[model samples]
Target: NDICLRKNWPMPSYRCVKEGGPAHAKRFTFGVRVNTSDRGWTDECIGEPMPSVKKAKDSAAVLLLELLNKT
Candidate 1:
């Protein structure tokens, strides 16, 4: 998100891509959209459940950061 702010591209958006599992062990998935172009709403990065959401989002953020944080 900060990266988007610093750059002149599009803002990042974290989306809920998937959610399913047993009642006890629910699954969670989210996709991050930082830069957008011809791809449309394509996820720049993708993640986990409630708590997993935070952890997985960190994964998403870090993954996206790994993609950038260079150029």
Candidate 2:
């Protein structure tokens, strides 16, 4: 969205890198990066363990967005 528009790049992509926890309680870890890059996306970022995949993705987007702002 804003990141792509501001950076003149395509929309970023997200992937679920890890999943764990008990049946009643679960956690999801999401990673977001530009489609072209292989690394550096997760640098200086933080992981927020989310209850659902959607929330995890949203949080990752926000984290990446904030990082973008920093630069």
Candidate 3:
């Protein structure tokens, strides 16, 4: 998240896209994206399932950073 702000890229956003696994061991999937312009936007980088929402969110952010770096 700091990388985006420090580089002046569009602010990143995250969302919980899926939830599964047993009731005693829930898993989550998250996606992160950023707006490139008024009409342009980066593709969402969906992360693998994680044991917790926080972990999923962090994974998505890391993927987003990697994607941004490639551009």
Candidate 4:
């Protein structure tokens, strides 16, 4: 199982990455763990339903893309 471990951030975890471009054009790529199983996750059991992890990843990616475009 995999998960994003950010002790400070709320809800989802995010970080910044400086992409090659103008200083303002720099982009960010947030770290996220995928293909996680239910059992290994804390407080969660196998065969239990949870929110979509892919959606969260997509959201982070989209936010990064938007920031890049604006920068």
User: What's each prediction's TM-score?
Assistant: 0.61, 0.68, 0.76, 0.28
Off by over 4 Å in 2: 20-25, 35-46
List all candidate RMSDs to the true structure: 3.3, 3.5, 2.5, 14.9
Scored against the true structure, residue 15 in model 3 reaches a CA lDDT of 82
lDDT of 3: 0.78
Off by over 4 Å in 4: 1-50
Cand. 1 Cα-lDDT: 0.64
Lowest lDDT sum, 10 consecutive residues, model 3, at 33-42
Using TM-score, give the best candidate's number: 3
> Which segments of candidate 1 are over 4 A away from where they belong?
36-43, 48-50
TM-score of 2: 0.68
Backbone clashes in model 3, listed as residue pairs: none
Candidate 2 per-residue lDDT, tens place, 3-22, comes to 65676666766678777757
Give residue 51's lDDT in candidate 3 (0 to 100): 91
User: Model 4, range 1-71, lDDT digits (tens) per residue?
Assistant: 11232222124333332233565543433343222233232221112111344443465545433433332
lDDT tens per residue, model 3, 13-67: 7789887756864789888887645445688889988998889999888888887
Clashes of each: 0, 0, 0, 0
If both were scored by lDDT, which would come out higher, candidate 1 or candidate 2? 2
lDDT of 1 by residue, 1-71 (tens): 67666766777777667765667655677767666443454446775344466666676777777655654
